[PDB]
Paper text:
The transient receptor potential channel TRPM7 is a master regulator of the organismal balance of divalent cations that plays an essential role in embryonic development, immune responses, cell mobility, proliferation, and differentiation. The TRPM7 structure represents a tetramer assembled of four identical subunits, with the overall architecture reminiscent of other TRPM channels.
The NTD includes four melastatin homology regions (MHR1-4).
Numbering used by the authors: 4 to 61, 69 to 464
The structure:
Amino acid sequence: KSWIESTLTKRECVYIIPSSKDPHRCLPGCQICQQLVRCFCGRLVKQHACFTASLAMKEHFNQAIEEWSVEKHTEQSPTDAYGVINFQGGSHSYRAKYVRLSYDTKPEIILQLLLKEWQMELPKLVISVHGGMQKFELHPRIKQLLGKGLIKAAVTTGAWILTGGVNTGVAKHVGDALKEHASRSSRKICTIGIAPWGVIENRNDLVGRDVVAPYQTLLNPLSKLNVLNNLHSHFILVDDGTVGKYGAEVRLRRELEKTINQQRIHARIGQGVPVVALIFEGGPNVILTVLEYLQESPPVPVVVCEGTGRAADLLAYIHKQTEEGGNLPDAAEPDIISTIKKTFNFGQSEAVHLFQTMMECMKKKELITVFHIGSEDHQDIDVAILTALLKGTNASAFDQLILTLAWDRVDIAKNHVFVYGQQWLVGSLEQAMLDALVMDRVSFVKLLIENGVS
């Protein structure tokens, strides 16, 4: 009778079409074995709950009727997996909420899952951390900088950190940041992990309506699948019926970022909630993700952290050696590709196609912000995340002060908005103090009095 029980759905295979070889027909092929078939469902037979598991399961060799779809061969039914993921380990008991969500869930129902059911406050910033998905490592000089810098931007602003949530990617290094640093105001940080329901180790230990589910974080059963992270506060487990596959999380994460960007950041303030991307290691698929962010509808600025590994060093290596309009000086094109040959070993064709993807990223160089870790003076990633939202978007100078006014952060406004050259018009500074008085932003009233407001 609750809201989650009446609205959200789970998905399961009902129409077994195997991916295997028959001894003669329609059925086994290791031995008889009575188990070892492999549906496009992804599970096997005897896993399809009690019914839809029988003989005459779909020369022929399971072809021409294959046509597998999670749209045309899957059954919707209400969710049986919401509650609490009290983690057994790491003496501070970390409570975390979760739900099993369908991939076809409407993007506004997901928003009233977060803002109404889970009673989360509307964020003032959304940080989407992308990068590696293969348990990479970090230089400890880099890790103590990115840890201190990411968590500062989520406390000073009221921010949501969207990770993959699973402990075999960049969600671990966000989780290590939440451990090694401030746990006093970390109750105010919402770190949402949007993962598939086919990757998680102990899914069957998360089954049940509202409950405190005991859940491991260790003991590593050959690491064939992956496990949830301890230091995420909320999990959105995306189900598309299948088991052991990746991909259902991708559209539901991005359409969440669109609808939060559509929401209004404050009652007085008339702007959308800003969304920023963060790129730790990479992979060949992250270069497509960066290019996707730059070209949709007014774009998501990306923040690339060099030194952190594989593809983020490539986007920094291009950003260094190009023209402001994104033009290599016609003599470095083999010099670029041979670096891609070493990092991403595909060879001579797909590295060329990956170079054409990076050249499309360099047309919009005003939206990409590289962070040079410790060899810099423009340090403190906290600044570099927030200043990426001001430059590149081509907003008004009034609109940059007002965005920093909501964040209650004056160091961004005093050093970057109030710079020489900014042409303030008549009623912009006067209306900004009217917002600064009502919102009880005392340090902005001090800043605008020192800039010409009576």
